[PDB]
Amino acid sequence: VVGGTEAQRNSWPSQISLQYRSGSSWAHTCGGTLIRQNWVMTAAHCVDRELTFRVVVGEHNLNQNNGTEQYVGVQKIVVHPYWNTDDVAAGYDIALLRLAQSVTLNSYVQLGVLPRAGTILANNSPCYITGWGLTRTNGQLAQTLQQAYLPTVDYAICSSSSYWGSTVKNSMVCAGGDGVRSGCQGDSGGPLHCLVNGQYAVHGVTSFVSRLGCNVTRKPTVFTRVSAYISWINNVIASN
Numbered sequence: 731v732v733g734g735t736e737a738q739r740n741s742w743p744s745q746i747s748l749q750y751r752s753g754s755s756w757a758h759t760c761g762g763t764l765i766r767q768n769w770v771m772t773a774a775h776c777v778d779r780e781l782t783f784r785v786v787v788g789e790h791n792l793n794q795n796n797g798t799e800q801y802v803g804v805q806k807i808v809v810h811p812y813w814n815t816d817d818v819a820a821g822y823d824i825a826l827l828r829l830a831q832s833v834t835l836n837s838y839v840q841l842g843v844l845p846r847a848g849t850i851l852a853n854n855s856p857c858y859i860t861g862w863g864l865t866r867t868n869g870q871l872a873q874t875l876q877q878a879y880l881p882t883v884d885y886a887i888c889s890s891s892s893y894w895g896s897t898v899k900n901s902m903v904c905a906g907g908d909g910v911r912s913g914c915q916g917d918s919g920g921p922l923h924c925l926v927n928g929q930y931a932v933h934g935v936t937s938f939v940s941r942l943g944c945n946v947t948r949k950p951t952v953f954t955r956v957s958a959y960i961s962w963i964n965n966v967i968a969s970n
C-alpha cells in the first residue's frame with residue numbers, strides 16, 4: 731500500500747497473509763480475506779505459481795511475534811475456471827483456498843462479510859485497502875499492516891479513455907487513482923473494505939495496478955468485484 735497509514739491491530743481481523751516457502755523460511759506474497767473458518771478468498775494470479783503456500787491469520791507485523799498469529803497450511807486451491815493468467819484484464823481474478831485446519835476466531839481473527847450479490851457502489855464511496863504490499867513503486871514490503879483510503883471510481887469513469895478504457899470490466903471495482911495512495915505489489919488478493927449502511931464489507935479482491943507504477947493519477951487500483959461472484963463462492967464451498 732502506497733500512501734497508507736499503519737492499521738490498528740484489531741481493525742481488519744479478516745485480513746490474512748498468504749506466504750510461500752522460501753528455503754528455510756516463509757515469505758509474504760499476497761493478501762486474502764478469511765471467509766469461513768477454513769476458507770480464504772484471494773486473487774487467482776496469486777496462486778499461479780506452483781509453490782507451497784500457508785496462510786497466516788491474526789498477523790500484524792510480518793517480521794515480529796505479535797502473540798496473535800495462527801499459521802495454517804493450504805489444503806486445496808480452487809481458481810475460477812474462466813481465469814486466464816495470459817489476460818488479467820479479462821477478469822475472473824479470484825480463487826478460494828481451503829485451509830488444512832479451521833482457525834479459531836477472536837478480536838484479531840474474524841470472517842469477512844461479503845456484500846449481497848449484484849451490489850454496486852456509488853461513485854466516490856468510502857473504502858479502505860489493506861495489506862503488506864510495497865510502500866512505494868519498486869519499493870519494499872511493509873512490515874506492519876497498512877491501510878489507505880481509496881474512494882471508488884464508478885465503471886463509467888473508470889472505463890473512460892483517460893482512465894482504464896476497455897481494460898476495466900463491469901465485474902471489477904476501481905478505487906483511488908489520486909496519484910498518492912494505491913495498492914501495490916504484495917497487496918494483491920487482499921480486501922477492499924467499504925462502509926455501507928454502517929458496516930464494512932469486503933467489496934473487492936485486489937487484482938492489478940498500472941505497469942507504469944502503483945500510484946498513478948487516473949489509474950485507480952482495480953479489484954475483482956466480490957458481489958459478482960457470490961454464487962460462485964457459495965457453490966465452491968458447498969461442493970468442497
Ligand code: NA
Nearest residue numbers: 791794795796
Ligand atoms: Na507477526
